[PDB]
Amino acid sequence: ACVFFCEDAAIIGLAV
Amino acid sequence: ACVFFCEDAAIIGLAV
Amino acid sequence: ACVFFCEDAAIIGLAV
Amino acid sequence: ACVFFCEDAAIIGLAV
Amino acid sequence: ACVFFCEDAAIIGLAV
Amino acid sequence: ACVFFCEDAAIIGLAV
């Protein structure tokens, strides 16, 4: 999987 | 966030 | 370039 | 893998 | 949105 | 091109 940095607010890492 | 269209098969829209 | 669908709120297309 | 919609012109789905 | 790291060279963080 | 950070385990930068 890959890590993405997106704002969910707050900016966090997300594993896809 | 961003909508990604990924296959896990089923092609799923992911809320990332 | 590629089109991404992300919320900027509102969800829109974005050309990268 | 994920489907990207990109052009280089025709827009196509790229399998990544 | 998501932060993408793309090269246009200079590698730029993009607010998408 | 964009740099993705992905693992399949070592995490590496993938050039897309």
Ligand SMILES: [Cl-]
């Ligand atoms: Cl994993």
Ligand SMILES: [Cl-]
């Ligand atoms: Cl273009």
Ligand code: NA
């Ligand atoms: Na990961």
Ligand code: NA
């Ligand atoms: Na485009």
